[PDB]
Amino acid sequence: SGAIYVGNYRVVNRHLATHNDWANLVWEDSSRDLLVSSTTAQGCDTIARCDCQTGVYYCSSRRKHYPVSFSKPSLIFVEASEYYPARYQSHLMLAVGHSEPGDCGGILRCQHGVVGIVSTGGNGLVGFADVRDLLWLDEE
Numbered sequence: 001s002g003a004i005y006v007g008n009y010r011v012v013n014r015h016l017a018t019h020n021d022w023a024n025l026v027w028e029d030s031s032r033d034l035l036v037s038s039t040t041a042q043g044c045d046t047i048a049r050c051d052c053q054t055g056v057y058y059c060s061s062r063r064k065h066y067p068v069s070f071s072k073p074s075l076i077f078v079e080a081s082e083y084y085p086a087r088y089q090s091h092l093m094l095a096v097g098h099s100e101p102g103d104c105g106g107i108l109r110c111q112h113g114v115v116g117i118v119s120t121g122g123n124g125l126v127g128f129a130d131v132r133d134l135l136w137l138d139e140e
């Protein structure tokens with residue numbers, strides 16, 4: 001589990017969104033595994049606006065933050081899980097790292113701010129849903 005709290009927005013994995021998230025929906029995209037809902041309080045996370053390929057992510061199944069190198073956001077085939085059938089997921093970045101289903105929501109960050117959240121995993125790989133192209137998170 002985990003979310004990004006920026007301005008009056010809450011960014012979560014779409015497959016982990018709650019009824020309150022759907023009842024206060026701002027935007028959702030199944031192909032990206034992302035859902036954004038509105039919040040009453042303002043959040044403290046800052047979104048990175050950059051092309052970094054090195055950063056650090058939080059892995060709840062190890063209670064540790066790991067430094068990683070990660071690929072550029074791309075269209076990647078992801079195998080079937082309990083949340084999605086086998087399909088192409090867009091704006092996804094991969095790194096070598098430990099991940100379990102419950103690690104989804106962990107933040108990946110670089111020197112500029114939050115880059116994305118854990119969304120996929122298995123066999124020593126971890127995939128992150130990018131949020132750096134969602135410029136509207138910084139306003140309104």
Ligand SMILES: Cc1cc(C)c(Nc2ccn(C)n2)c(C)c1
Binds near residue numbers: 078102119120123
């Ligand atoms: C972060 C994360 C997410 C998921 C859903 C998974 N399990 C599975 C099982 C089959 N897939 C394709 N994925 C793992 C290991 C890690």
Ligand SMILES: [Zn+2]
Binds near residue numbers: 050
């Ligand atoms: Zn950066």
